[PDB]
Amino acid sequence: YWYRLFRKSKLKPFERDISTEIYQAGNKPCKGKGPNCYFPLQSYGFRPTY
Amino acid sequence: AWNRTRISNCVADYSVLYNFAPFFAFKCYGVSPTKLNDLCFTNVYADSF
Ligand SMILES: *[C@@H]1O[C@H](CO)[C@@H](O)[C@H](O)[C@H]1NC(C)=O
C-alpha cells in the first residue's frame, strides 16, 4: 500500500493520479538520481506491532 | 548540536546555491522555493546536520 509521493500534474477535485514515472525536478531531463528527483512511491510499514 | 543559522533581516536567496552543490535529498515539506526573496519572518530555527 504505497502513495504518490510526487507527481508532475496538479490535482483537481474528482481526479485520479495514474502516472508513476520519475518526477522530473530539473530543467534537464531528470531520470532517477542526480537532481532532487526520487521514486514517487514509498512503502508503508503496515505492521501489527506498530 | 545544530548551528543557530538565524536568517533574519536579509533576503533568504539561497536558491542560487542549488547550482553550487548537487543537492540530492531536497525534501521541502511546507514551502519549496526555487527562488526566495520576498517575505520577512521573525524566527527561522535553521539547523545544520
Ligand atoms: C560551495 O561553493 C563551491 C564553489 O566555490 C561549490 O563547488 C560547492 O558545491 C558549494 N557548496 C555549497 C553547499 O554551496
UniProtKB/Swiss-Prot annotation, chain A:
**Effect recorded for Q42Y:** Reduced host ACE2-binding affinity in vitro
Residues of the region (Disordered) are: 5-39
Reported impact of Q42R: In strain: Omicron/BA.1, Omicron/BA.2, Omicron/BA.2.12.1
Outline the segment boundaries, as ranges, of region: Immunodominant HLA epitope recognized by the CD8+.
1-6
What does the subunit section of this Swiss-Prot or TrEMBL entry state?
Answer: Binds to host ACE2. RBD also interacts with the N-linked glycan on 'Asn-90' of ACE2. Cleavage of S generates a polybasic C-terminal sequence on S1 that binds to host Neuropilin-1 (NRP1) and Neuropilin-2 (NRP2) receptors. Interacts with host integrin alpha-5/beta-1 (ITGA5:ITGB1) and with ACE2 in complex with integrin alpha-5/beta-1 (ITGA5:ITGB1). May interact via cytoplasmic c-terminus with M protein. May interact (via N-terminus) with host bilirubin and biliverdin, thereby preventing antibody binding to the SARS-CoV-2 spike NTD via an allosteric mechanism.
The protein's job, in short, is: Attaches the virion to the cell membrane by interacting with host receptor, initiating the infection. The major receptor is host ACE2. When S2/S2' has been cleaved, binding to the receptor triggers direct fusion at the cell membrane. When S2/S2' has not been cleaved, binding to the receptor results in internalization of the virus by endocytosis using host TFRC and GRM2 and leading to fusion of the virion membrane with the host endosomal membrane. Alternatively, may use NRP1/NRP2 and integrin as entry receptors.
Q: What is this protein called?
A: Spike protein S1
Q: Which residues of the full protein are shown?
A: 451 to 501 of 1273
